[PDB]
Design a protein around this ligand. Structure first.
Ligand SMILES: [Mg+2]
Ligand SMILES: [Mg+2]
Ligand SMILES: [Mg+2]
Ligand SMILES: [Mg+2]
Ligand SMILES: [Mg+2]
Ligand SMILES: [Mg+2]
Ligand SMILES: [Mg+2]
Ligand SMILES: [Mg+2]
Ligand SMILES: [Mg+2]
Ligand SMILES: [Mg+2]
Ligand SMILES: [Mg+2]
Ligand SMILES: [Mg+2]
Ligand SMILES: [Mg+2]
Ligand SMILES: [Mg+2]
Ligand SMILES: [Mg+2]
Ligand SMILES: [Mg+2]
Ligand SMILES: [Mg+2]
Ligand SMILES: [Zn+2]
Lengths: 153, 148, 108, 292, 166, 308
RNA sequence: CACCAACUUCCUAAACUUAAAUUGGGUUAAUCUAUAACUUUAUAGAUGCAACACUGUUAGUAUGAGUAACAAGAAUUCCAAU
C-alpha cells in the first residue's frame, strides 16, 4: 500500500535521491534548459519552484542564504539566483517553469523524455503547440452564440 | 478406411437399361514386344483370342502395336470419359483373356464405396408420410381447448 | 518441477496469438503543420525540436569561448545578437553573444 | 412526372461531359509547381484537362488526400475534382489553416445543396415543390438556409417535430452513400434547357450568365440531383459528420405564393463537437436568419 | 538455401486485350539475414497486414521494438522500386497484401553454468518478406447480422433427408 | 489517413472560446437546479398516509470525517459526518417491472462534469432536465411512499433518535498475503526455518487429490460493498445538510455512501413518527432550527456537567 | 402367455472347423555377376540382402520458453572535453 506518498523512490536510497535532484537543479540554474527522463524531471520540478521563493526573500536573510548554499553545488551561481532569476519573477505568484514531453530517446533503452526550463530565458523559443484560431468553422459558431447572449441581456 | 475415402450413390450413365442397352467400353490398346519373355503370354493371346473377341463385341475398336517394349500394357477407355490402365507383365493367356472380359462388362464409373444398394426416383405411389396422416380432423377446425 | 509432457503446436498457437499479446494500433498520430512530419498529439514534434537544439548548441559554444574558464557565470542578464544587429538602449550592461549567421526566421 | 425531369436532365448532363472530353485530342503536358509551405519545390507533370488537384495530392501521400478540402490555383479556389487547364502554381487548404475563410464558405454551400436534395424527394409525388434559391449567409449567422415554394394545398400545413426528424434521417442516409460533388462549367444555353420549368432558376441563370464576360454557368451534381452553384464545393459528402434540420419558417410577405425557408447546421469530421456544445448551437439555429 | 521470392519480380504476362479489366501491379521484396528472432518479428509483421503504405509507415515510426525500424526501411525500398521499375503511377496507391517472417541460418556457441557444466546457445537470425499490391486496401470484415444467422439455420433444416431408408 | 482518430472537448476550442464554454456550462447547471426547487407546486403525486409495513426512500451522502461527542452522563462517542449534496429522485419502476414484490426508486447525487461522459448517460439526464450525477442506487419503496421523479431530497428527511443503515465500498489494499488477508499465524522466525515465515501451510488433505472450491488463498483485498447496521442518529444540521451517525462507516473520506433507515427486527415500524413520504421545505409550514439534537446529547454552550 | 437378444445355426455366394516357447513347408522387396532385354523387364549364379523400440551411435530440429538469468553515476559547451 502506498496511499498518500508524495515522493518517488530513486537512486540508492533517501539520501541518494536528494543528491540526484540537487545535481539536476544545479544544472537547470546554470543552463536554464535541461533534458532528463520524464519521471526525474517531474520530481525535480517542485524544488525548482520553491528555490525561486527563497531567492525572493533577499540576499540578507540568513535562512535563505543557507538553503541556497546547500542546493547549489557550484558557488558562482548564488549571485545569479539572488540578482538575476529572483528579480525576473517579482510580479508572478508562481508557475516559473515550463515542462513538456519529448520524443522517446533513441538509445536502445527507449526511455520517456522531457525538457524543463525557466520562463523568460534568452534561448530560442521551444516549438510549443498553438490552439486553433477563432477564424475556424467551429470557433465562429461559438463566437456568434456569445455575441447574441451578451447583447440580448 | 470409409472415413478415409470418398463415396457415391448407385447410378447409370444415361439410363442404360430403359430403352436400349449400350456397351460403355469403346476402345482397347495393347502393346507388345516381338521377342521378350515377359510378353510371351500376350503374344499367344493375339495369335488365338484377339480376333474372336473383336467379333463378339463389334462396338469396341481394338489396336495392336508390336514394338520394342519392356512391359506389355492394356488401356481401356469408356464413353463417359474414364480411362483405365493395366500391366500384363509375364501373364498367361488365360489370365489376359479373363481380364479383358471384365473390362467389357464394366461402366467407367468409379469403383468406391456405394452408400446404398437400391436407387429409386419414384419411391412413393400413395404419398410420403407426414405427421398429419393418421390424425383425425375436428368439427369447425377447433384446436384443443379453443372455446369458439 | 519439470514438465510432464510436451506442449503441442496447436496449444502453443493459442497462447501466443491471443489478442492480449498482439501490438495495439495507435490513434494519436498527426502531421506537423510547420514541417509536415509526423508527431503524436501530446508530444512535441521531433523534426522541429531538432532545429532548436542545434542552434542552442551553437550559442552555448560561443558562450564558452567568451568566459574562458569555469566559475565565470555573470551576475547580469544575457542576450544574443546576429550580424547586422546592434544593441539597443535597453540592452546596456548585459552580456552580448555574437553569431556570424543571420537571424533565423523562426527565432523571434 | 418528376421522374421524367430527372432522367432527361441527367442525359443532357452526361452529353455535355462527353462533348468536352471529345474536344481534347491526345495528351498535353502541363507543368504545375507546388508553392505550399511543406514539401516545397515539387513539380508535377500532368495531363491537360484530365488530371485534377486530387491527383496531385495522390503523388505526395495519403495525408494530403484526406485533409485537403480545397486548392488555390494561382490564387483562386478550385474544386478538388475539377480538371486543371494550364500550367500554374498550386496549394492545398484545410479546415485548420490560420485563415480558413475560403474553406468555410465552400463547406457552407455544400451543406445547403444537400438540404435541397432532401426536400424534393421527401414529399408525396402528388404535391408540387419548386426550389427557388439558396441564400448567401455568413457562418456567424448560425445556420445555412434554403428557400423553397411548396404547393397551394400545403399552405395550411406546418411540419411537426416528427417531420423534421424524418428529414434528418434522409440527410444522414445521403452522407452514408458517400457521393462525390461533380462540376461542370457550361454555356447559359444548356443551363436554361435543363431548368426551363423552374422560372426562378431561369432568371437566376440569366443573372449569373450576364455577370461573366461569356455565358459560363457553374453546374454541380450529387447523385441524380443537379443545381447551379455560387462557387466551389466540398469534394465528397462523407466530409460531414453531424447534420441537423433545425426548423422551418414561413416568410410573411408571401401573398402570391408561400415561401418557406429551411434552416440547418452541420460540422465536418475534422471538427467534431462535444454533446452539450452541439445542443447549444442547434437551439440558436432555430431563429429566423435575415439575408444582409 | 532457397531464393524464390526474388525471382517473382521477373514474370511477364502477355499484353491485355482492350475488353478486359486493368491488371494491378505486384512487387516482391525481402531482406535476408537479420540479427533478430523470427518469433519476435512475427508480431510486427502481423500488425501491418492489410493496411495501406502510409498507415503502415505511420504506425512503425512510433514503435519501440528494434524490428520496427528494419521493417520500415524494407517498406521504403519497395515503394521506390514500385514506381521506378514496375510502372506504378502514384506512390500512395499501395497496400500490403503479404508480410511474414522466416527462419535463417543460425550459429551454435557455449553457455556456461556453475559446476563445470554448460549448455548450447543459438545466435538466431530471420528473414522478412512482403508483397505490395496496387490499389486501395480491400474493405474490412462485417460480422454476420441476426437475420443472416437465421437464414443459415433454415437452410440446415431444409437439407435434412430420411436416412438409411429407401 | 482515411482512418479513425480520437478527440476530446478541448481539442478544437480556441483561447477565447475555452473560457466561454466553461462559463456557459456552469450557468446551465444553476438554471436547471433552481427549477426543481418547488416540487409541491409542480403537480405532486398524491400523498397517502402511513400504514404498518411501509418502507421509505433513502439518500446518497458524502463522507466528510469524524469528531468527538458527549452525552449528559459524560460518555464520549466518536461520530462520522455525512453531507447530502444534490440528491434527486431519477426513475420509478412499478412492482411488476422491477420483478420484485415491491417497487423500486433510483436516486442520484454529487453533480459532476459533463465533458468526459458517454452520450447515453447525457441523453438520459437531458430528459429529466438535470445535470449528471456521479452515482445511482436503487431503493425498495411501497406504493403509498412513491415519489415523483425529479424531486429534491434533503438531510431533514432523517431525524435524531432513529437508527439507520449505511453501505459503501471499503478501502482498497491491493494484492495481499494470507497473514494480512485472513489472519494466518505463520511460522517461527528462528530455530532453523528455511524461507518459510509468512506462507500458508498445507492446502488440504492428500486423499482428495484436489483443492476444495472456496479455499482461502492470497488475493486482492478490499474495494467491496459492505453494510453497517443499527447506527444511531445524534444530530442534524439543517443549514448545511449534515447528518451525524454513531461509529464508523466504510470507505475513505470524500466517498459516496447510501443511507436508509434500519432494517433490524427491533426498529420495525419507527417510520410512523418521521415524515412519511419525505420532508418538503417548499411547504414552509414552519422553518426548522439550524441544529437538531437528541435529548441525551450535551450541547455546546450549555453549563459544565456536574454529576450530582 | 409373447417379444427382444452372440458368424451359435440356416439363407445368396463361398468355406470344409478350437494363448503360446518350439517344430515342418510355399512365396517375395533390394543390389551385384553371366546371358539376354531397351521408359526399366526374363532365366540362373551370388550377398555387408529388409528395424515404431537395445537410458543404442552420429547429425538435425522441437518442448520447457521468448522463460531463468545478464548490464552503463548526473548535466553540458562533449568519450584521452569541462
Ligand atoms: Mg502514489
Ligand atoms: Mg483447447
Ligand atoms: Mg535449445
Ligand atoms: Mg466508544
Ligand atoms: Mg488502495
Ligand atoms: Mg510471528
Ligand atoms: Mg528466514
Ligand atoms: Mg478426486
Ligand atoms: Mg461358425
Ligand atoms: Mg501365436
Ligand atoms: Mg544389414
Ligand atoms: Mg534407438
Ligand atoms: Mg522455442
Ligand atoms: Mg513458466
Ligand atoms: Mg515471472
Ligand atoms: Mg527476472
Ligand atoms: Mg553500475
Ligand atoms: Zn514539426
Amino acid at each position: 500500500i502506498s496511499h498518500g506518498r508524495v515522493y518517488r523512490r530513486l537512486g540508492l536510497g533517501p539520501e541518494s535521491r536528494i543528491h540526484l535532484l540537487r545535481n539536476l537543479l544545479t544544472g537547470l540554474v546554470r543552463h536554464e534548459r535541461i533534458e532528463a527522463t520524464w519521471a526525474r524531471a517531474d520530481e525535480m520540478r517542485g524544488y525548482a519552484e520553491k528555490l525561486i521563493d527563497y531567492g525572493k526573500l533577499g540576499d540578507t536573510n540568513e535562512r535563505a542564504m543557507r538553503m541556497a548554499d546547500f542546493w547549489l553545488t557550484e558557488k558562482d551561481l548564488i549571485p545569479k539566483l539572488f540578482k538575476v532569476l529572483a528579480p525576473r519573477f517579482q510580479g508572478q505568484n508562481g508557475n516559473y517553469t515550463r515542462m513538456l514531453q519529448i520524443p522517446n530517446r533513441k538509445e536502445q533503452d527507449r526511455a520517456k523524455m522531457a525538457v524543463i526550463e525557466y520562463k523568460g530565458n534568452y534561448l530560442p523559443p521551444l516549438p510549443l503547440p498553438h490552439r486553433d484560431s477563432n477564424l475556424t468553422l467551429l470557433n465562429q459558431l461559438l463566437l456568434g452564440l456569445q455575441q447574441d447572449l451578451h447583447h440580448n441581456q | 478406411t470409409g472415413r478415409g475415402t470418398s463415396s457415391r450413390f448407385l447410378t447409370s450413365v444415361l439410363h442404360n437399361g430403359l430403352g436400349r442397352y449400350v456397351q460403355q467400353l469403346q476402345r482397347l490398346s495393347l502393346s507388345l514386344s516381338r521377342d521378350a519373355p515377359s510378353s510371351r503370354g500376350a503374344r499367344e493371346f493375339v495369335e488365338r483370342e484377339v480376333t474372336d473377341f473383336a467379333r463378339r463385341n463389334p462396338g469396341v475398336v481394338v489396336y495392336v502395336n508390336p514394338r520394342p517394349c519392356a512391359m506389355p500394357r492394356i488401356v481401356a477407355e469408356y464413353l463417359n470419359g474414364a480411362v483405365r490402365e493395366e500391366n500384363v507383365n509375364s501373364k498367361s493367356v488365360e489370365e489376359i483373356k479373363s481380364l479383358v472380359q471384365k473390362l467389357a462388362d464394366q461402366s467407367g464409373l468409379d469403383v468406391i464405396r456405394i452408400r446404398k444398394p437400391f436407387h429409386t426416383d419414384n419411391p412413393s405411389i400413395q404419398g410420403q408420410w407426414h405427421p398429419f396422416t393418421n390424425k383425425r380432423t375436428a368439427l369447425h377446425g377447433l384446436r384443443p381447448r379453443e372455446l369458439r | 518441477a519439470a514438465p510432464k509432457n510436451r506442449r503441442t503446436i496447436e496449444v502453443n498457437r493459442c497462447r501466443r496469438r491471443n489478442p492480449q499479446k498482439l501490438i495495439k494500433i495507435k490513434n494519436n498520430i498527426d502531421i506537423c503543420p510547420e514541417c509536415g512530419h509526423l508527431k503524436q498529439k501530446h508530444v512535441l514534434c521531433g523534426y522541429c525540436y531538432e532545429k532548436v537544439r542545434q542552434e542552442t548548441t551553437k550559442i552555448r559554444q560561443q558562450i564558452g569561448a567568451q568566459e574562458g574558464g569555469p566559475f565565470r557565470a555573470p551576475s547580469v542578464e544575457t542576450m544574443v545578437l546576429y550580424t547586422g544587429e546592434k544593441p539597443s538602449e535597453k540592452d546596456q550592461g548585459k552580456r552580448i553573444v555574437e553569431r556570424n549567421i543571420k537571424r533565423p526566421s523562426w527565432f523571434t | 412526372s418528376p421522374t421524367e425531369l430527372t432522367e432527361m436532365r441527367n442525359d443532357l448532363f452526361n452529353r455535355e461531359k462527353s462533348r468536352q472530353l471529345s474536344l481534347t485530342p491526345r495528351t498535353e503536358k502541363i507543368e504545375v509547381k507546388h508553392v505550399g509551405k511543406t514539401d516545397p519545390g515539387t513539380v508535377f507533370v500532368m495531363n491537360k484537362n484530365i488530371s485534377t488537384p486530387y491527383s496531385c495530392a495522390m503523388h505526395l501521400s495519403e495525408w494530403y488526400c484526406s485533409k485537403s478540402i480545397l486548392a488555390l490555383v494561382d490564387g483562386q479556389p478550385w474544386d478538388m475534382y475539377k480538371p486543371l487547364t494550364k500550367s500554374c502554381e498550386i496549394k492545398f487548404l484545410t479546415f485548420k489553416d490560420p485563415d480558413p475563410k475560403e474553406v468555410n464558405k465552400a463547406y457552407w454551400r455544400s451543406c445547403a445543396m444537400m438540404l435541397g436534395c432532401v426536400i424534393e424527394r421527401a414529399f408525396k409525388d402528388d404535391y408540387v415543390v419548386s426550389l427557388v434559391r439558396a441564400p448567401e449567409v455568413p457562418v456567424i449567422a448560425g445556420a445555412f438556409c434554403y428557400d423553397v415554394t411548396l404547393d397551394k394545398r400545403l399552405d395550411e400545413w406546418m411540419p411537426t417535430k416528427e417531420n423534421l426528424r424524418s428529414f434528418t434521417k434522409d440527410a444522414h442516409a445521403l452522407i452514408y452513400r458517400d457521393l462525390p460533388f461533380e462540376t461542370l462549367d457550361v454555356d447559359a444555353r444548356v443551363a436554361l434547357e435543363i431548368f426551363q420549368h423552374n422560372k426562378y432558376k431561369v432568371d437566376f441563370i440569366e443573372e449569373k450568365a450576364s455577370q461573366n464576360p461569356e455565358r459560363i454557368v457553374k453546374l454541380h451534381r450529387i447523385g441524380d440531383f443537379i443545381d447551379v452553384s455560387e462557387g466551389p464545393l466540398i469534394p465528397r459528402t462523407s466530409v460531414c459528420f453531424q447534420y441537423e434540420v433545425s426548423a422551418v419558417h414561413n416568410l410573411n410577405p408571401s401573398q402570391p405564393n408561400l415561401i418557406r425557408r429551411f434552416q440547418g447546421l452541420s460540422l465536418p469530421t475534422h471538427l467534431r463537437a462535444q454533446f452539450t456544445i452541439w445542443d447549444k448551437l442547434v437551439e440558436r439555429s432555430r431563429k429566423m436568419v435575415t439575408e444582409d | 538455401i532457397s531464393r524464390k521470392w526474388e525471382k517473382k519480380n521477373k514474370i511477364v504476362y502477355p499484353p491485355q486485350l482492350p475488353g478486359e479489366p486493368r491488371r494491378p501491379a505486384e512487387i516482391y521484396h525481402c531482406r535476408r539475414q537479420i540479427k533478430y528472432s523470427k518469433d519476435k518479428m512475427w508480431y510486427l509483421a502481423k500488425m501491418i497486414r492489410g493496411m495501406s503504405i502510409d498507415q503502415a509507415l505511420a504506425q512503425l515510426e512510433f514503435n519501440d521494438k528494434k524490428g520496427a525500424q528494419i521493417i520500415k526501411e524494407v517498406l521504403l525500398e519497395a515503394q521506390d522500386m514500385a514506381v521506378r521499375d514496375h510502372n506504378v503511377e502514384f506512390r500512395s496507391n499501395l497496400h500490403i497484401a503479404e508480410s511474414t517472417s522466416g527462419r535463417g541460418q543460425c550459429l551454435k556457441r557455449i553457455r556456461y553454468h556453475g559446476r563445470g557444466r554448460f549448455g548450447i546457445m543459438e545466435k538466431v537470425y530471420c528473414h522478412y518478406f512482403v508483397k505490395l499490391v496496387e490499389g486501395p486496401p480491400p474493405p474490412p470484415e462485417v460480422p454476420k447480422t441476426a437475420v443472416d444467422h437465421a437464414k443459415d439455420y433454415i437452410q440446415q433444416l431444409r437439407s435434412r433427408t430420411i436416412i438409411h431408408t429407401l | 489517413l482515411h482512418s479513425k482518430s480520437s478527440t476530446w472537448w478541448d481539442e478544437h476550442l480556441s483561447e477565447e472560446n475555452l473560457s466561454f464554454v466553461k462559463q456557459l456550462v456552469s450557468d446551465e447547471n444553476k438554471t436547471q437546479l433552481t427549477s426543481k426547487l418547488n416540487p409541491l407546486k409542480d403537480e405532486p403525486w398524491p400523498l397517502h398516509p402511513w400504514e404498518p409495513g411501509s418502507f421509505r426512500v433513502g439518500l446518497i451522502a458524502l463522507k466528510l470525517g469524524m469528531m468527538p461527542l458527549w452525552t449528559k452522563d459524560g460518555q464520549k462517542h466518536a461520530v462520522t459526518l455525512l453531507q447530502v449534496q444534490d440528491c434527486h429522485v431519477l426513475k420509478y419502476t412499478p412492482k411488476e417491472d422491477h420483478n420484485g414484490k415491491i417497487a423500486a426508486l433510483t436516486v442520484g447525487g454529487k453533480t459532476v462534469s459533463r465533458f468526459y461522459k458517454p452520450d447515453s448517460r447525457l441523453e438520459f439526464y437531458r430528459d429529466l432536465g438535470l445535470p449528471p450525477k456521479q452515482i445511482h442506487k436503487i431503493f425498495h419503496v411501497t406504493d403509498n411512499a412513491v415519489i415523483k421523479p425529479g424531486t429534491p431530497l434533503y438531510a431533514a428527511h432523517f431525524r435524531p433518535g432513529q437508527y439507520v443503515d449505511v453501505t459503501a465500498k471499503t478501502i482498497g489494499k491491493g494484492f495481499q498475503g494470507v497473514m494480512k488477508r485472513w489472519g494466518f499465524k505463520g511460522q517461527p522466525a528462528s530455530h532453523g526455518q528455511t524461507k518459510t515465515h509468512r506462507r500458508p501451510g498445507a492446502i488440504s488433505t492428500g486423499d482428495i487429490a484436489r483443492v476444495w472450491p472456496g479455499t482461502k488463498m492470497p488475493g486482492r483485498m478490499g474495494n467491496q460493498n459492505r453494510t453497517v447496521y443499527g447506527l444511531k442518529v445524534w444530530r442534524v444540521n439543517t443549514k448545511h445538510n449534515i447528518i451525524y451517525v454513531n461509529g464508523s462507516v466504510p470507505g475513505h473520506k470524500n466517498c459516496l455512501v447510501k443511507i436508509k433507515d434500519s432494517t433490524l427486527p427491533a426498529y420495525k415500524d419507527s417510520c410512523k413518527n418521521l415524515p412519511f413520504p419525505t420532508y418538503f421545505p417548499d411547504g414552509d409550514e414552519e422553518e426548522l432550527p439550524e441544529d437538531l439534537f437528541d435529548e441525551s446529547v450535551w450541547q455546546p454552550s450549555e453549563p459544565s456537567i456536574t454529576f450530582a
